[PDB]
Scaffold this active site. Structure first.
Site, PDB file in Angstrom:
ATOM      1  N   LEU A  25      12.092 -22.943  -7.617  1.00  0.00           N
ATOM      2  CA  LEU A  25      11.451 -21.767  -7.022  1.00  0.00           C
ATOM      3  C   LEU A  25      10.086 -21.581  -7.643  1.00  0.00           C
ATOM      4  CD1 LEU A  25      14.413 -19.229  -7.011  1.00  0.00           C
ATOM      5  CD2 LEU A  25      13.775 -20.855  -5.243  1.00  0.00           C
ATOM      6  N   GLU A  32      15.310 -10.159  -8.412  1.00  0.00           N
ATOM      7  CA  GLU A  32      15.535 -10.775  -7.114  1.00  0.00           C
ATOM      8  C   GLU A  32      16.790 -11.646  -7.170  1.00  0.00           C
ATOM      9  OE1 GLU A  32      15.467 -13.649  -5.149  1.00  0.00           O
ATOM     10  OE2 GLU A  32      15.791 -12.362  -3.416  1.00  0.00           O
TER      11      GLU A  32
END
Ligand SMILES: NC(=O)C1=CN([C@@H]2O[C@H](COP(=O)(O)OP(=O)(O)OC[C@H]3O[C@@H](n4cnc5c(N)ncnc54)[C@@H](OP(=O)(O)O)[C@@H]3O)[C@@H](O)[C@H]2O)C=CC1
Ligand SMILES: CCOC(=O)CCCOc1ccc(OC)c(Cc2cnc3nc(N)nc(N)c3c2C)c1
Ligand SMILES: [Cl-]
Length: 206
Positions: A25, A32
């Site tokens: 990511l 999150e």
């Protein structure tokens, strides 16, 4: 006997639809991730006696998760790989497609099993997301929108927030997101490490 349950896609993406970089990511968003875990794990209380959700993922995604977090805990993990071989694993489901995944789960977790399936999630791979978006049972996208054009090299395959797809995909009210998710969810912009993001839920009619 297979196309019973709807599917739900969950994804964190940029306004440019970026979802990943050099196999990871391109952000570190601890809250999150925490929302990802809560959504993918939530099972209503009466049902939580005997029911679990399922996470479906590509092989590239199973590999991209730090070894310490696999299998994603407390969820039935299935890795989708066109190449059902030696990869290992403490009890770890393999299917060659999204539909073969569903058949394995309905076979493995029928009334006859002590563990029962609540919701089924597709948690990515761009390539698996692509198959999910083409699947007639996918009806819901839990999207975290990242308001920065972070450099990515892997993209979500369908521009579902854009005008061309807006008669098919509709963003739901926040209370409806919270209803579906089973708790209060931060409403509006969240800032964790450089940029704003927010939680959305989109649906389409089957
Ligand atoms: N931002 C977000 O929310 C998310 C981002 N990501 C990111 O996405 C990137 C991974 O994306 P991508 O490269 O598309 O990887 P995927 O995770 O989709 O791909 C991994 C592999 O899974 C199998 N696979 C996927 N779809 C199918 C299918 N329809 N049929 C058979 N097998 C399938 C593999 O086949 P084979 O074994 O034949 O090679 C494919 O090569 C990483 O950067 C990861 O960090 C991942 C999840 C969420
Ligand atoms: C126990 C405390 O330990 C933890 O906190 C859990 C560890 C999770 O760490 C991860 C590290 C890298 C990673 O890249 C893939 C993922 C997968 C992920 C992350 N966000 C995600 N966020 C969204 N909106 N959607 C996803 N689909 C998603 C997905 C698949 C997880
Ligand atoms: Cl998790």
């Amino acid at each position: 006997m297979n196309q019973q349950k709807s599917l739900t896609l969950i994804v964190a993406l940029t306004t440019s639809y970026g979802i990943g970089r050099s196999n990871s990511l391109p952000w570190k968003l601890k809250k999150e991730i925490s929302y990802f875990k809560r959504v993918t794990s939530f099972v209503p209380t009466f049902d939580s006696f005997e029911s679990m959700n399922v996470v479906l993922m590509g092989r590239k995604t199973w590999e991209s998760i730090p070894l310490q977090f696999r299998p994603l805990k407390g969820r039935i993990n299935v890795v989708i790989t066109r190449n059902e071989s030696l990869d290992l694993g403490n009890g770890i489901h393999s299917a060659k497609s999204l539909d073969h995944a569903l058949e394995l789960l309905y076979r493995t977790y029928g009334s006859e099993s002590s563990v029962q399936i609540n919701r089924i999630f597709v948690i990515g791979g761009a390539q698996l997301y692509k198959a999910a978006m083409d699947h007639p049972k996918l009806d819901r996208i839990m999207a975290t929108i990242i308001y920065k054009d972070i450099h990515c090299d892997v993209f979500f395959p369908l521009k579902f927030r854009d005008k061309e797809w807006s008669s098919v995909w509709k963003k739901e009210k926040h209370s409806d997101l919270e209803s579906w998710v089973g708790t209060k969810v931060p409403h509006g912009k969240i800032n964790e490490d450089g940029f704003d993001y927010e939680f959305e839920m989109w649906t389409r009619d089957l």
